[PDB]
Design a protein around this ligand. Structure first.
Ligand SMILES: Nc1ncnc2c1ncn2[C@@H]1O[C@H](COP(=O)(O)O)[C@@H](OP(=O)(O)O)[C@H]1O
Ligand SMILES: CC(C)NC[C@@H]1CCc2cc(CO)c([N+](=O)[O-])cc2N1
Ligand SMILES: [Ca+2]
Ligand SMILES: [Ca+2]
Ligand SMILES: [Ca+2]
Length: 246
């Protein structure tokens, strides 16, 4: 199995629902950050090595392709960070693969990112995220990898991640750049809420007859998951409160 769909959309743009939609369409796994967090934490250090290679002035792209092939063996599609930041390298590796860009209102995106992924350094909620992550075995190596992959997506060496203007500017620029670099015939821009119609047409499949388009991974659910992880101290003992999570 090889990559058929490359998801270029940023975190908090509907990537987990798209992951679930592609798994329905193809009956084969799709990569997502939640594969790392909940299934393959050993992938963190491999992604870090790939991201480190992007920091060099002249990255060895073939070293990156090699690592990507290893990470993505067995998967038919990618979404979310860290893979989205590698969409150009994936397009070269898989020239027949189609590219998705999931997108949403930038201000809704920023809030979602701040509540789930990248709280500001002085937000007390950041401590709750850290505590709940500790329950999952997630440590500082994960945060470094996630942040470095977002900076690679935004093509920045340093950025003050607490600066909302920079994040909004980079979101807009990233989404613009995808449309500048990917030929339109190979790109579907999927707006949050769009559903099956445009995706199935783009992928040359019928709409799945009696299956609703997924609506997964809301910030409310992620906040509740963090709170329950902290209180109950176990994923397995609370997972049933979050049906369809992983
Ligand atoms: N079918 C759908 N329709 C509307 N919003 C959806 C959706 N599927 C996911 N979302 C929203 O997409 C965001 C998650 O994206 P990702 O999976 O990339 O992290 C969440 O936004 P909120 O945080 O505003 O709730 C989620 O509610
Ligand atoms: C489970 C919860 C208590 N903490 C883990 C959360 C899960 C959601 C999440 C999603 C992304 C992008 O999908 C990233 N990310 O890009 O770093 C980090 C996190 N962190
Ligand atoms: Ca480089
Ligand atoms: Ca500016
Ligand atoms: Ca629709």
């Amino acid at each position: 199995t090889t990559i058929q769909v490359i998801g270029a959309g940023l975190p908090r743009t509907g990537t987990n629902s798209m992951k679930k939609a592609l798994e329905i369409i193809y009956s084969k796994p799709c990569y997502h950050m939640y594969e790392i967090i909940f299934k393959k934490q050993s992938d963190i250090s491999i992604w870090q090595q790939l991201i480190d290679e992007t920091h060099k002035t002249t990255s060895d792209k073939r070293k990156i392709y090699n690592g990507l092939n290893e990470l993505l063996n067995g998967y038919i599609a990618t979404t979310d960070l860290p893979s989205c930041s590698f969409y150009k390298e994936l397009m070269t590796m898989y020239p027949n693969a189609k590219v998705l860009l999931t997108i949403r209102d930038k201000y809704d995106w920023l809030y979602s990112l701040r509540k789930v992924v990248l709280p500001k350094s002085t937000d007390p909620w950041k401590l709750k995220i850290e505590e709940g992550d500790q329950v999952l075995g997630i440590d500082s190596n994960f945060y470094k990898m996630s942040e470095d992959s977002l900076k690679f997506a935004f093509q920045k060496n340093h950025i003050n991640l607490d600066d909302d203007e920079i994040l909004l500017e980079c979101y807009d620029e990233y989404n613009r750049l995808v449309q500048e670099i990917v030929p339109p015939e190979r790109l579907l821009i999927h707006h949050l809420g769009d559903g099956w119609e445009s995706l199935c047409q783009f992928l040359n499949v019928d709409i799945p007859n009696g299956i609703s388009y997924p609506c997964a991974n809301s910030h409310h659910q992620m906040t509740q998951l963090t709170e329950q992880l902290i209180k109950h101290k176990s994923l397995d003992d609370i997972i049933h409160m979050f049906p369809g999570l992983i």
